[PDB]
Amino acid sequence: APVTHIWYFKGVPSRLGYLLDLAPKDLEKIIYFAAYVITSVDEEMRHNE
Amino acid sequence: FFDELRIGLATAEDIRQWSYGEVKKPETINYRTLKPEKDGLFCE
Amino acid sequence: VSGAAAAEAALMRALYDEHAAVLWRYALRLTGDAAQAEDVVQETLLRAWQHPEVIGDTARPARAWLFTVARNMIIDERRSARFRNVVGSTDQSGTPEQSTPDEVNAALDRLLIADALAQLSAEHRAVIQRQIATDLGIAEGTVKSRLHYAVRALRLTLQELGV
Amino acid sequence: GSTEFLPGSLIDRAEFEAENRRVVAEGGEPAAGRPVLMGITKASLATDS
């Protein structure tokens, strides 16, 4: 299972957080299975339904 | 004599290209024969 | 239907939230290492999911069964696999250092051996620096001999120097 | 301007003038400058090596 390199997550400033515009705390919840995250959403199908 | 020293992110492919094999088993050695267990952290 | 395959999970996640955070503390006190406790907890609960004959009787204490499962696994780790190794750590301030000798002798020996090689003939040389009879294109008795006489010239030179 | 210098970054006043030398002669806009004082620690971490 893929895993994140702590240096780029927790190291300040959170490099991943800067790359994805994701807050460090949100990213922490994501990586350590505290919250789900939406990868993709078919907005057109949703509009049509 | 070598001019530059480059550093960058290691691709998964680079990590696999370095390794001479995967460490499957978690064993270290045998505490009687002092021989390293196969596919362990000391696999010969 | 599919609701049942989901009911399996919804049944496990309901014992987690009530027994995992407590089982952890037990293995913690018994091992003094939260990491191994984290491991043992998952091992235990996996077995639990594998032994449904225990949670089915909801009205009975399940935690009580879990504690014994864990308590047994910990000592299984205190088995022969622990007695020999668990002692020290290299980076722990209290262990020596793998020290390698100073190559003085070996180097002086080879420096002499190299000085009693200029005192040779190129053929004795090519033979000593190597069954060889297959390459150099000579007999095996020629080998045996050239080896013999060459080694004796070498011993002669060496003892001439006072070895 | 026409340089690849990330605005807000602190760059040695030699490379700045050399790069604006090439760009001024190239037709593009030379990067703007403003003298900046750095403490010894921060300048030491900013070395090219």
């Binding site: 994140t4 190291g11 993709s40 | 290691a10 270290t28 952290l41 | 496990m12 750590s89 | -």
Partner: protein, 195 residues
């Protein structure tokens, strides 16, 4: 997921961030940041400047941000994590061996769980432990509480091999120990010449 699962896709853990990096247009976000930079309030401009400093790196250098998520971890050669024997018949081992060993254990358990179809809760709560263990291997203690060894002693990580006075850089590179050298007490020798 039970209601509107056909319209979106969601995930958890580190694999999800891997996916996010995959579905990410580096150049586009870089240009969005530059547009914010050309004309913006300092309050909301410093944040964008510092973000560009990161994104433009991946943009120019031609290395993918996917590198920040690992599919395989390297194992340091054995002589740099040596295992020595004690004069009492027992053994002492480098801390890296304990860390690598814990990581290997959790990884093989993840393989088992994936094969056995364990409940999703166990698989995810195991992936989290693998994450924490690789975090410890690389920079133990960086996040939260360190991995205690025997005696509630924090174990040394790979990144602990380099920091400070005892790190490789300052201890074994900027200053070595040298052959052909000695030391002793000093005494004044008045009859000596200056040279």
């Amino acid at each position: 997921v039970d209601r509107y699962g056909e319209y979106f896709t969601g995930a958890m853990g580190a694999e999800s961030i891997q996916k996010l990096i995959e579905n990410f247009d580096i150049d586009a976000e870089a240009e969005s940041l530059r547009d914010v930079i050309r004309n913006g309030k300092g309050q909301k401009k410093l944040r964008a400047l510092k973000r560009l400093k990161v994104v433009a790196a991946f943009q120019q250098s031609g290395n993918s941000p996917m590198g920040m998520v690992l599919d395989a971890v390297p194992v340091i050669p054995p002589e740099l994590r040596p295992m020595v024997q004690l004069d009492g018949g027992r053994f002492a081992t480098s801390d890296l061996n304990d860390l690598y060993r814990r990581v290997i254990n959790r990884n093989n358990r993840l393989k088992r769980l994936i094969d056995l179809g364990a409940p999703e809760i166990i698989v995810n709560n195991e992936k989290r432990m693998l994450q924490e263990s690789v975090d410890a291997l690389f920079d133990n203690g960086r996040r939260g509480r360190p991995v205690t060894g025997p005696g509630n002693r924090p174990l040394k990580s790979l990144s602990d091999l380099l920091k400070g006075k005892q790190g490789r850089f300052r201890q074994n590179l900027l200053g070595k120990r040298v052959d052909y050298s000695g030391r002793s007490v000093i005494v004044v020798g008045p009859q000596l010449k200056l040279h």
